[PDB]
Scaffold this active site. Structure first.
Site, PDB file in Angstrom:
ATOM      1  N   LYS A  41      33.336  35.481  30.100  1.00  0.00           N
ATOM      2  CA  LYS A  41      33.779  35.353  31.674  1.00  0.00           C
ATOM      3  C   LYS A  41      33.564  33.965  31.784  1.00  0.00           C
ATOM      4  O   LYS A  41      32.312  33.381  31.254  1.00  0.00           O
ATOM      5  CB  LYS A  41      32.699  35.997  32.386  1.00  0.00           C
ATOM      6  CG  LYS A  41      33.059  36.086  33.853  1.00  0.00           C
ATOM      7  CD  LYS A  41      32.352  37.110  34.600  1.00  0.00           C
ATOM      8  CE  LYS A  41      32.809  38.581  34.072  1.00  0.00           C
ATOM      9  NZ  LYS A  41      32.598  39.797  34.928  1.00  0.00           N
ATOM     10  N   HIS A 119      31.086  42.195  45.328  1.00  0.00           N
ATOM     11  CA  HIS A 119      31.776  40.913  44.814  1.00  0.00           C
ATOM     12  C   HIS A 119      31.237  39.620  45.188  1.00  0.00           C
ATOM     13  O   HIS A 119      31.028  39.363  46.189  1.00  0.00           O
ATOM     14  CB  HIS A 119      33.235  40.917  45.062  1.00  0.00           C
ATOM     15  CG  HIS A 119      33.959  39.643  44.885  1.00  0.00           C
ATOM     16  ND1 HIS A 119      34.426  39.066  43.605  1.00  0.00           N
ATOM     17  CD2 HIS A 119      34.406  38.620  46.028  1.00  0.00           C
ATOM     18  CE1 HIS A 119      34.965  38.069  43.783  1.00  0.00           C
ATOM     19  NE2 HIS A 119      34.914  37.607  45.123  1.00  0.00           N
ATOM     20  N   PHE A 120      30.912  38.658  44.088  1.00  0.00           N
ATOM     21  CA  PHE A 120      30.098  37.348  44.443  1.00  0.00           C
ATOM     22  C   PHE A 120      31.562  36.428  44.798  1.00  0.00           C
ATOM     23  O   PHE A 120      32.196  36.168  43.553  1.00  0.00           O
ATOM     24  CB  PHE A 120      29.424  36.980  43.332  1.00  0.00           C
ATOM     25  CG  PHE A 120      28.582  35.774  43.895  1.00  0.00           C
ATOM     26  CD1 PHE A 120      29.120  34.733  43.520  1.00  0.00           C
ATOM     27  CD2 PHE A 120      27.093  35.810  44.090  1.00  0.00           C
ATOM     28  CE1 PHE A 120      28.550  33.351  43.800  1.00  0.00           C
ATOM     29  CE2 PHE A 120      26.562  34.744  44.365  1.00  0.00           C
ATOM     30  CZ  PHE A 120      27.229  33.618  44.109  1.00  0.00           C
ATOM     31  N   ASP A 121      31.416  36.051  45.738  1.00  0.00           N
ATOM     32  CA  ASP A 121      32.645  35.016  45.950  1.00  0.00           C
ATOM     33  C   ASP A 121      32.387  33.403  45.656  1.00  0.00           C
ATOM     34  O   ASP A 121      33.371  33.043  45.113  1.00  0.00           O
ATOM     35  CB  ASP A 121      33.320  35.039  47.381  1.00  0.00           C
ATOM     36  CG  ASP A 121      34.612  34.714  47.762  1.00  0.00           C
ATOM     37  OD1 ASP A 121      35.370  35.358  46.927  1.00  0.00           O
ATOM     38  OD2 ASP A 121      35.189  34.145  48.418  1.00  0.00           O
TER      39      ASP A 121
HETATM   40  C1  LIG Z   1      33.306  30.868  41.689  1.00  0.00           C
HETATM   41  C2  LIG Z   1      32.506  31.997  40.858  1.00  0.00           C
HETATM   42  C3  LIG Z   1      32.788  33.153  40.594  1.00  0.00           C
HETATM   43  N1  LIG Z   1      32.055  34.160  40.081  1.00  0.00           N
HETATM   44  C4  LIG Z   1      32.470  35.288  39.499  1.00  0.00           C
HETATM   45  C5  LIG Z   1      32.839  36.233  40.426  1.00  0.00           C
HETATM   46  C6  LIG Z   1      34.047  37.219  39.706  1.00  0.00           C
HETATM   47  O1  LIG Z   1      33.154  38.302  39.306  1.00  0.00           O
HETATM   48  P1  LIG Z   1      32.965  39.864  40.163  1.00  0.00           P
HETATM   49  O2  LIG Z   1      32.696  40.822  39.049  1.00  0.00           O
HETATM   50  O3  LIG Z   1      32.129  39.602  41.374  1.00  0.00           O
HETATM   51  O4  LIG Z   1      34.505  40.196  40.791  1.00  0.00           O
HETATM   52  P2  LIG Z   1      35.152  41.378  40.615  1.00  0.00           P
HETATM   53  O5  LIG Z   1      36.825  41.035  41.113  1.00  0.00           O
HETATM   54  O6  LIG Z   1      35.371  42.356  39.271  1.00  0.00           O
HETATM   55  O7  LIG Z   1      34.577  42.249  41.817  1.00  0.00           O
HETATM   56  C7  LIG Z   1      34.080  43.543  41.857  1.00  0.00           C
HETATM   57  C8  LIG Z   1      35.082  44.418  42.697  1.00  0.00           C
HETATM   58  O8  LIG Z   1      34.913  43.926  43.783  1.00  0.00           O
HETATM   59  C9  LIG Z   1      36.370  44.338  44.787  1.00  0.00           C
HETATM   60  N2  LIG Z   1      36.349  43.363  45.806  1.00  0.00           N
HETATM   61  C10 LIG Z   1      36.243  43.692  47.161  1.00  0.00           C
HETATM   62  N3  LIG Z   1      36.412  43.030  47.955  1.00  0.00           N
HETATM   63  C11 LIG Z   1      36.805  41.922  47.446  1.00  0.00           C
HETATM   64  C12 LIG Z   1      37.132  40.496  47.885  1.00  0.00           C
HETATM   65  N4  LIG Z   1      37.153  40.274  49.185  1.00  0.00           N
HETATM   66  N5  LIG Z   1      37.521  39.669  46.903  1.00  0.00           N
HETATM   67  C13 LIG Z   1      37.705  39.977  45.567  1.00  0.00           C
HETATM   68  N6  LIG Z   1      37.285  41.034  44.949  1.00  0.00           N
HETATM   69  C14 LIG Z   1      36.795  42.144  46.074  1.00  0.00           C
HETATM   70  C15 LIG Z   1      37.323  43.860  43.352  1.00  0.00           C
HETATM   71  O9  LIG Z   1      38.687  44.224  43.481  1.00  0.00           O
HETATM   72  C16 LIG Z   1      36.347  44.376  42.246  1.00  0.00           C
HETATM   73  O10 LIG Z   1      36.940  45.905  42.176  1.00  0.00           O
HETATM   74  P3  LIG Z   1      37.079  46.524  40.713  1.00  0.00           P
HETATM   75  O11 LIG Z   1      37.513  45.675  39.559  1.00  0.00           O
HETATM   76  O12 LIG Z   1      37.894  47.981  40.937  1.00  0.00           O
HETATM   77  O13 LIG Z   1      35.454  47.319  40.370  1.00  0.00           O
HETATM   78  C17 LIG Z   1      34.435  36.265  38.639  1.00  0.00           C
HETATM   79  C18 LIG Z   1      35.658  35.935  38.901  1.00  0.00           C
HETATM   80  O14 LIG Z   1      35.782  34.724  39.649  1.00  0.00           O
HETATM   81  P4  LIG Z   1      37.075  34.284  40.660  1.00  0.00           P
HETATM   82  O15 LIG Z   1      37.121  32.461  40.968  1.00  0.00           O
HETATM   83  O16 LIG Z   1      38.352  34.892  40.194  1.00  0.00           O
HETATM   84  O17 LIG Z   1      36.396  34.782  41.994  1.00  0.00           O
HETATM   85  O18 LIG Z   1      33.602  35.037  38.866  1.00  0.00           O
HETATM   86  C19 LIG Z   1      30.475  33.781  39.987  1.00  0.00           C
HETATM   87  O19 LIG Z   1      29.678  34.815  39.677  1.00  0.00           O
HETATM   88  N7  LIG Z   1      30.271  32.514  40.509  1.00  0.00           N
HETATM   89  C20 LIG Z   1      30.928  31.795  41.095  1.00  0.00           C
HETATM   90  O20 LIG Z   1      30.370  30.872  41.677  1.00  0.00           O
END
Ligand SMILES: Cc1cn([C@H]2C[C@H](OP(=O)([O-])OP(=O)([O-])OC[C@H]3O[C@@H](n4cnc5c(N)ncnc54)[C@H](O)[C@@H]3OP(=O)(O)O)[C@@H](COP(=O)(O)O)O2)c(=O)[nH]c1=O
EC number: 4.6.1.18
Length: 124
Positions: A41, A119-121
Site C-alpha cells: 500500500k 475509511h480514512f480520507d
Molecule cells: C491519502 C491517504 C490515504 N490513506 C489510505 C486510505 C485508503 O485505504 P482505506 O482502506 O481506508 O480505503 P478503502 O476504500 O478500502 O475503504 C474501506 C471501505 O470504505 C468504503 N467507503 C465508504 N465511504 C467511502 C468514501 N466516502 N470514500 C471512499 N471509500 C468509502 C470503501 O468503498 C471500502 O469498502 P470495501 O472495499 O468494500 O471494504 C488508501 C487509498 O488511498 P486514496 O488516496 O485512494 O484515498 O490509502 C491513508 O491511510 N492516509 C492518507 O493520508
C-alpha cells in the site's frame, strides 16, 4: 469475517502507543496488520487515539471527501497519527516504509447504523 468498521480498526487504529515507537514502526505495523500481502500500500495512516474519540468524528465537521462523496467528517481537534509512506526503493514483496509522526486533523468517511468510520480520507 470482518465488517467495514472492523477493517478500519485493523487498518488505521493503534491506541496502544501515544505515537509511533521506533523508526521501524511502519515496516512492522504494515506487516502485522496484513497491509502488504498482495502489494505494497503506497500510504497508510495510523491513529493514536482511543476508538471512542475517533468514532466521535462522525458527528463532527461534515466536509467533502476526496472522491466527491459527502459522507466525510473532519475532527475539530488535532489527533496524534503516523503516516507510513513507501521509500523510493520499496518494491513488492519487499515493501519498506518511512515513518512520519504528526499531529493533525483527520478526515474519515462514516457509514452504517451505527454511523461509524469505515475509511480514512485524509489529514489536514
Ligand atoms: C491519502 C491517504 C490515504 N490513506 C489510505 C486510505 C485508503 O485505504 P482505506 O482502506 O481506508 O480505503 P478503502 O476504500 O478500502 O475503504 C474501506 C471501505 O470504505 C468504503 N467507503 C465508504 N465511504 C467511502 C468514501 N466516502 N470514500 C471512499 N471509500 C468509502 C470503501 O468503498 C471500502 O469498502 P470495501 O472495499 O468494500 O471494504 C488508501 C487509498 O488511498 P486514496 O488516496 O485512494 O484515498 O490509502 C491513508 O491511510 N492516509 C492518507 O493520508
Amino acid at each position: 469475517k470482518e465488517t467495514a468498521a472492523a477493517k478500519f480498526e485493523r487498518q488505521h487504529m493503534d491506541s496502544s502507543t501515544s505515537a509511533a515507537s521506533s523508526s521501524n514502526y511502519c515496516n512492522q505495523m504494515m506487516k502485522s496488520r496484513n497491509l502488504t500481502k498482495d502489494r505494497c500500500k503506497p500510504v497508510n495512516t495510523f491513529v493514536h487515539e482511543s476508538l471512542a474519540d475517533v468514532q466521535a468524528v462522525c458527528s463532527q465537521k461534515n466536509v467533502a471527501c476526496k472522491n466527491g462523496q459527502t459522507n466525510c467528517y473532519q475532527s475539530y481537534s488535532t489527533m496524534s497519527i503516523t503516516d507510513c509512506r513507501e521509500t523510493g526503493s520499496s518494491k513488492y514483496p519487499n515493501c519498506a516504509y518511512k515513518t512520519t509522526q504528526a499531529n493533525k486533523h483527520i478526515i474519515v468517511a462514516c457509514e452504517g447504523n451505527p454511523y461509524v468510520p469505515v475509511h480514512f480520507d485524509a489529514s489536514v
